[PDB]
């Protein structure tokens, strides 16, 4: 009795659509150390609970197509944005790392590439979201968007990303 | 190459070495195989497609498996790949079909048997009594209690 549901940043991962399979790709950091990373290859759609944040994510291979969060604050959906984010394995996120040169590094062996990189953006996600990108919104089915100074905008939003009330 | 695939997952050997020798083995099923056997201490690394394990092995018998995998299916592939490479004597005498697969060599005509299902391959491996990783018994349930011999699974 193995649940297919998963955790990652603090936030249960549970899968409602898709599929993938694992690929091992080299990924060149903002730090300009070279990882390897497993790629999760395909389309999914996952729903993330956490305490204070939930979060619907839809992506393809490297790439956010979709983020809907809800949460009790701006700071709780702050940090589910920061795990997507991460989770999303987009290049954009992995130049985004500045300094920890032997935490975000091959040749740490304590922990893995991609919990490397979510422990480095939960200490601080002021780059990665300044180097995430933006784009206007539709405000419609009542949601609403998030700049990267983690200011809401009826206009605009981080790529992908949409608040929606709890 | 210390590289190969089996049972799609590649295989890297990370320490220790290996002669082969041609071994009979009697099946579960009553006929004889001929295998090439392994012979030697060997540490292994899985990555497959679905799940990574790390595998340590002697001459015919599974020391350690640590396996990692997000659901049932892919932690049992992995386990059932690696008890297979093995060779045990206690996974050969589990097989309970015809090993007519297209004609396929005597280790990939037991790894398709077992990948069919892997009851009887996991009731007759054995448990044993068992910091972070956890056991996993024949009918796939975690448990901090025991575990089938040798294997673990952890988030790696």
Redesign the interface.
């Known amino acids: 009795?193995?649940?297919?549901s998963?955790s990652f940043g603090g936030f249960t991962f549970k899968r409602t659509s898709g599929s993938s399979?694992?690929?091992?790709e080299e990924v060149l950091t903002g730090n300009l150390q070279t990882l390897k990373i497993?790629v999760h290859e395909g389309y999914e759609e996952f729903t993330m609970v956490g305490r204070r944040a939930t979060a619907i994510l839809r992506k393809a291979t490297r790439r956010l197509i979709q983020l809907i969060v809800s949460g009790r604050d701006e700071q709780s959906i702050a940090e589910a944005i920061i795990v997507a984010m991460v989770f999303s394995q987009e290049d954009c996120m992995i130049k985004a790392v500045r300094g920890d040169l032997n935490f975000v590094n091959r040749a740490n062996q304590r922990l893995?590439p991609m919990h490397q990189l979510l422990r480095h953006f939960q200490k601080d996600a002021k780059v990665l979201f300044q180097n995430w990108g933006v784009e206007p919104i539709d405000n419609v089915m009542g949601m609403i968007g998030i700049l990267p100074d983690m200011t809401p905008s009826i206009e605009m939003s981080m790529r992908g990303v949409r608040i929606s009330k709890m």
């Open positions: 009795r193995i649940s297919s998963f399979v694992k690929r091992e497993r893995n």
